[PDB]
Amino acid sequence: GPLGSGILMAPKTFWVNEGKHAKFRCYVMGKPEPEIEWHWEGRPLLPDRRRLMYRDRDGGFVLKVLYCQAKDRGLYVCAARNSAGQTLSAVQLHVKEP
């Protein structure tokens, strides 16, 4: 049942303090090796100074948004696809302003 978290169910909301880093970790299984990409508010996420993406040693893919700002709030989706199919996981980030 590859349904993916937070797509059928309501996604979880995780609060982060403004100015601090937020790490998004997601483990994905598939043959063949599924190619994964990140999205934010229905827009593609692209590697920046601020936004970094790498695969953690010991398995799953990581997205790291550094120095969180109020504007960084939204729906973060981890999309993973291979020859047989695609599956998404979603999560919501809220920012605690000082």
Place this chain on the structure above:
Amino acid sequence: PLGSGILMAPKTFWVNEGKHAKFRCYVMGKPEPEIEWHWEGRPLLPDRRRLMYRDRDGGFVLKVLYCQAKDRGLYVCAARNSAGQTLSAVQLHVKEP
């Protein structure tokens, strides 16, 4: 859900005698699948030497502390829920000083 090292030959990971060896394994299922460890076809049970806990990154961990030559063997992570069961396997060899 075929599970690693069951159809394929399991990987062999060497460890130095006297050091700790960490076994990490991530598992998916609805409902939440109950997992148990086995060694050489015997159930692994929590000891002073052998510890089992679920990591904060997700995934279940087995930690065998102060490895001895006798600790060699086939280590299997068995996971089962209402719908089914799936195993992953791996082989530990010990490098004696």
Place this chain on the structure above:
Amino acid sequence: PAAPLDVKCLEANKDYIIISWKQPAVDGGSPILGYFIDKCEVGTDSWSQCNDTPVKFARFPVTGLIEGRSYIFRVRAVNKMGIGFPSRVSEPVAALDPAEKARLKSRPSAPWTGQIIVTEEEP
């Protein structure tokens, strides 16, 4: 005009999804003539405008849904001068009849187990 707030789904079906939203703060620049609703299939980054002319009623039925696919939504306010920026996007909404969503949500899947990663640590 300021972006609308709190986009949520009132009702959902294979056929259509009814989405509502909270009106933005009253800027007094030009009265809000209506709103535009945009949908996006969760995986893709293609945003499509659902209504061709603005709607005033703050709840809207969305059609043209591929059955079983999940969608997200945003709203843009529109006045005489033009269209504002989009709202913060909604939680994903799957185009399924309620019983099928319930069925899928409470369905068992056989467990899958990853490769065992073995590593050495130092006492």
Place this chain on the structure above:
Amino acid sequence: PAAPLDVKCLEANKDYIIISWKQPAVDGGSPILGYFIDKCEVGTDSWSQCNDTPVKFARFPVTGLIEGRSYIFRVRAVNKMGIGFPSRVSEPVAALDPAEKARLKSRPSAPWTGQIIVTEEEP
């Protein structure tokens, strides 16, 4: 007697699995009369003795396999002065015809995505 070494699978089918082993280090205690082979279905911890009386030939066909299930094996040497301890257990062997094992091994599976774990850090 010392435990046999390197328990390997020579051939595997739905019907039976043929397993071999290396003879243990030779001792002047008493000549090895034969060996006993034990099988265990990988998940369970139940070990069953395959042969009721010892076998001398260092390769053995194992029957009574539930099709599609994976098994592990150990061997015990036996002399006039009793049975020795078991060998280090084999790599798991699935009871499938070779073509079905090949088919399953090279089969595509739709991806599954885990929950997104969000955590706070600071530099």
